[PDB]
């Protein structure tokens, strides 16, 4: 008897075939232009897609006027539009099966910083997030895999307490100016 919670999940699944030439290269392509650390960040985004795809194909077998299909189909589609992976005019349960991994990986905070001109490369973006140089609205974020909603897209600012933001110089610049 303790006042603890033991509920926890796994956010990835290892593939059955560990060494196949086609899967090794499509994963390496995704690590390349999205600047990921391992294959686990590929398998995690692959796993969150299959959870959505499983929910879509369960509702699709239900008949059209079923009230659980209408409530949870609208709920699922609203969540995908909110994170910006679906267009406004594509709200139907059939368009969900046409998503790919690259649509989810494009919404990370690491990718949005490179796309917004706050960084010089996708790898420069990742080190800039981690070093507390990037904020969203008014909140500093360390997490590169922070999925950016549509309302937070135009509010990705550049950290008033950072050297690149408000203007307090860093440790290196302060030490160097003391030499002269």
């Amino acid at each position: 008897p303790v006042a603890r919670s033991w509920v926890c999940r796994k956010t990835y699944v290892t593939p059955r075939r560990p060494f196949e030439k086609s899967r090794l290269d499509q994963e390496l392509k995704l690590i390349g232009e999205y600047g990921l650390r391992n294959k686990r960040e590929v398998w995690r985004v692959k796993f969150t897609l299959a959870k959505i795809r499983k929910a879509a194909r369960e509702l699709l077998t239900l008949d059209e006027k079923d009230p659980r299909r209408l409530f949870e189909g609208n709920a699922l589609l609203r969540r995908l539009v909110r994170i910006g992976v679906l267009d406004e005019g594509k709200m139907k349960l059939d368009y969900i099966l046409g998503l790919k991994i690259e649509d989810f990986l494009e919404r990370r905070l690491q990718t949005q910083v490179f796309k917004l001109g706050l960084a010089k490369s996708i790898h420069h973006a990742r080190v800039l997030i981690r070093q507390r140089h990037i904020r969203v609205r008014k909140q500093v974020v360390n997490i590169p895999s922070f999925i950016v909603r549509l309302d937070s897209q135009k509010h990705i600012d550049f950290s008033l307490r950072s050297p690149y933001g408000g203007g307090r110089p860093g440790r290196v610049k302060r030490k160097n100016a003391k030499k002269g």
Binding site: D25, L28, I31, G32, L36, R37, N38, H123
Partner: peptide
Amino acid sequence: KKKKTGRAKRRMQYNRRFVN
């Protein structure tokens, strides 16, 4: 010399296999 580890090792592997 030493070898890079982590995210930068995957970046170097991606360049040797895909770009060049």
